[PDB]
């Protein structure tokens, strides 16, 4: 009941994700090292992690079917507003409900200049998302749907974005119906869209604490140019 186009879309997103997510963490070595001893001691490392992750999210976004049809401006607006959300999403793959250096916990994030106001709901998110035990097919569709959202502020051709997203949305809904067996499939789509809603709230809180954090020039100094451009300066 999955059309050939929908199977095409899944194959494309799977490969796109495989080409942008290295589970071996080979590149983490090139980041400024994590410091655990420590005010904002993890900021340099996590900033590089996030900067790296933005690059990977962009590479993924470009391979989303239809994304190349949007204008340069709309591509920018979608990536700027969704970046942190897709990084939180993709990070679920490394999250465990149970390396050692690149295994991050609450205190690490706290040492990057954030409070429990963000960290608590972020952990709730990760646990709740993990619980869904999504197929990888569903995981990559959710990231793409997150990126191509009509309602992002600054979108010009919202009708086009929405049309590109509906195609991705219909592919997910059909995949679940045809490929994800119950009970695991029970209301799975609704629960995935709720995760996207959770992500909007996580996005807003991160934005707040990022403004506070990056207000001090001595902390802004510890960020990267890409982070400053995408998250703001």
């Amino acid at each position: 009941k999955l059309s050939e186009e929908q199977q095409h879309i899944i194959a494309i997103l799977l490969d796109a994700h495989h080409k942008t997510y290295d589970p071996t963490y080979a590149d983490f070595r090139d980041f400024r090292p994590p410091v655990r001893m420590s005010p904002l001691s993890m900021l340099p490392h996590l900033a590089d992690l996030v900067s790296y992750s933005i690059q990977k999210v962009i590479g993924f976004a470009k391979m989303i079917p239809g994304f190349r049809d949007l204008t340069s401006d709309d591509q920018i607006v979608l990536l700027k507003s969704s970046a942190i959300e897709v990084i939180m999403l993709r990070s679920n793959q490394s999250f465990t409900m149970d390396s050692q250096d690149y295994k991050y916990d609450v205190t690490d994030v706290s040492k990057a200049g954030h409070t429990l106001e963000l960290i608590e709901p972020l952990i709730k998110f990760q646990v709740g998302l993990k619980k869904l035990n999504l197929h990888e097919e569903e995981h990559v569709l959710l990231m793409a749907i997150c990126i191509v959202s009509p309602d992002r502020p600054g979108v010009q051709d919202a009708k086009l974005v929405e049309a590109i997203q509906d195609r991705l949305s219909n592919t997910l809904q059909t995949y679940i119906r045809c490929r994800h067996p119950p009970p695991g499939s029970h209301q799975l789509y609704a629960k995935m869209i709720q995760k996207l809603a959770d992500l909007r709230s996580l996005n807003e809180e991160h934005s707040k604490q990022y403004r506070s954090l990056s207000f001090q020039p001595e902390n802004s100094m510890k960020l990267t140019p890409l982070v400053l451009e995408v998250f703001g300066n």
Binding site: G59, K62, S72, Q75, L79, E229, V230
Partner: peptide, 11 residues
């Protein structure tokens, strides 16, 4: 603002 780096990475 302008986003040269983001612009460049999006091709």
């Amino acid at each position: 603002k302008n986003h040269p780096m983001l612009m460049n990475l999006l091709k």
